[PDB]
Design a protein around this ligand. Structure first.
Ligand SMILES: [Mg+2]
Lengths: 148, 58, 58, 78, 58, 49, 58
């Protein structure tokens, strides 16, 4: 298990500043088991997200559950059991800015992790104990599945 | 016409190897070119030779 | 032809092509202030190896 | 000692490549092993990159004193 | 049209051309496409030496 | 000569000379405004001038 | 603000990513600043009066 982070999220607001784009919507989520909030861009043409939906988000450093960290190039054509088979929406981007919050003047532990999926951003913000294993310039697979 | 006058007045000036700017006869105009001795064609910042924050992020 | 700043004259590496117009890349339209509306641009071929080298470097 | 700048300026680079390409356009001996390059300016630039041009730059300070710099001991750059 | 303003300040040169320009992005930014009917007239005197005798024979 | 109908050739004006001064191309400016316009060898006496 | 000891032993090691600067980056930073400052000086011989005239008349 090379999972960095795995939690259940709930959508609080679909489009905060109006529908700026046709295919991409700027989700604003929040979790249950931790006090995480989640800004996310998803492709709503291939995968529609409604207002009160509730999905399980996973961020893993690899797609193979035996722990094989070898990734020279992704092959879409090859078929083998992977981690993506349990999920409905898999992106892939790079962490590029770990940044501490400035809203508190002393004794705070909220960290932000900006992950950019080819331009589709994601702010994963929460307590610093959850985000262990995030580094700058590490390449993560986001995985995502709506729940009933 | 303004540019022709400025060219005929300024064209003799050259930057010597001891970093002074002397006229045609050899009187000193400036002891160092512009105070610092730096080229305006190589300014990465707002009229300053570097912008340190961008270089450190690089 | 109306040569305002010093980038109204630069040196390109020529390549020969069949049709009857000087054809340069459009990213170089900002130095010449060219506009492709029947504008003409002069050509100068230097005749000496020192002139080639000074044109190519400077 | 020599007090001037150790970088080859762009004017020194232009004229050293000019005079060297002019000498290679006449029948001077080429110091590097050329590989079918014909235009003598390319041969002069290949001599400059490999530091073999037999030119000494004499830089004149405006009072009259001068300084001799070999081309092989300047710090060339882009 | 006297000697000074007509002939000393700026004098006419040969080995030159003048054509209408038209865009072409497929070239690099340091290339210009000279037509064939100009490049047959404009010439460069290349001295014969050891490196290019077989090129100049052709 | 002057125009196109005389097969005349272009003009290094008073402004392109300035632009060639601005690059510091000394030998190119020499070649343009002397060698490819009108070259001529005189012999000047050094004593009487 | 985050309570990070400088010994390098605090347990959420992501906290060392916040304002991370290493001695290798300090060496490369200072060499890059010195190289840009040395290449940014006015090279001697530059016709700097003509550059003044054109950069004002343009
Ligand atoms: Mg026009």
């Amino acid at each position: 298990a090379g999972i960095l982070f795995e939690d259940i999220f709930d959508v609080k607001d679909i489009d905060p500043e109006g529908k700026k784009f046709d295919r991409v919507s700027r989700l604003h989520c929040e979790s249950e088991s931790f006090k995480m909030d989640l800004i996310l861009d998803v492709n709503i043409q291939i995968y529609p997200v409604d207002l009160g939906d509730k999905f399980r988000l996973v961020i893993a450093s690899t797609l193979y559950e035996d722990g094989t960290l070898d990734d020279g190039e992704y092959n879409p054509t090859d078929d083998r059991p992977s981690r993506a088979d349990q999920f409905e929406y898999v992106m892939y981007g790079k962490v590029y800015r770990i940044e501490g919050d400035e809203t508190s003047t002393e004794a705070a532990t909220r960290l932000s992790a900006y992950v950019s999926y080819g331009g589709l951003l994601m702010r994963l913000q929460g307590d610093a104990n959850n985000l262990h294993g995030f580094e700058v310039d590490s390449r993560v697979y986001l995985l995502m599945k709506k729940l009933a | 016409y303004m540019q022709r006058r400025l060219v005929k007045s300024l064209e003799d000036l050259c930057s010597q190897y001891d970093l002074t700017v002397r006229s045609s006869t050899g009187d000193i105009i400036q002891f160092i070119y512009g105070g610092d001795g730096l080229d305006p064609a190589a300014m990465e910042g707002k009229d300053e030779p570097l912008e340190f924050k961008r270089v450190l992020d690089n | 032809q109306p040569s305002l700043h010093k980038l109204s004259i630069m040196a390109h590496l020529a390549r020969v092509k069949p049709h009857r117009t000087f054809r340069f890349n459009e990213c170089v339209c900002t130095p010449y202030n060219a506009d492709f509306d029947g504008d003409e641009m002069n050509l100068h071929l230097p005749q000496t190896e020192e002139a080639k080298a000074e044109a190519l470097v400077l | 000692k020599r007090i001037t700048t150790p970088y080859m300026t762009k004017y020194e680079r232009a004229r050293v490549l000019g005079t060297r390409a002019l000498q290679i356009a006449m029948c001077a001996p080429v110091m590097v092993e050329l590989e079918g390059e014909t235009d003598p300016l390319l041969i002069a630039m290949k001599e400059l990159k490999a530091r073999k041009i037999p030119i000494i730059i004499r830089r004149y300070l405006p009072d009259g004193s001068y300084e001799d710099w070999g081309v092989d001991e300047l710090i060339i750059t882009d | 049209q006297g000697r000074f303003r007509g002939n000393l300040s700026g004098k006419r040169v040969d080995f030159s051309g003048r054509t209408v320009i038209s865009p072409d992005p497929n070239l690099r930014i340091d290339e210009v496409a000279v037509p064939v009917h100009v490049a047959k007239i404009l010439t460069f005197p290349e001295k014969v030496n050891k490196a290019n005798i077989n090129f100049l024979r052709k | 000569t002057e125009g196109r109908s005389r097969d005349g050739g272009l003009r290094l004006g008073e402004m392109e000379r300035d632009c060639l001064i601005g690059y510091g191309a000394s030998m190119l400016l020499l070649e343009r405004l002397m060698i490819s316009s009108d070259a001529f060898e005189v012999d000047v006496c050094g004593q009487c001038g | 603000k985050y309570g990070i000891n400088d010994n390098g032993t605090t347990e959420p090691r992501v906290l060392y990513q916040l304002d991370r600067i290493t001695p290798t980056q300090v060496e490369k930073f200072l060499e890059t600043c010195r190289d840009k400052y040395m290449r940014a000086q006015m090279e001697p011989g530059s016709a700097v009066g003509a550059l003044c005239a054109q950069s004002i008349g343009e």
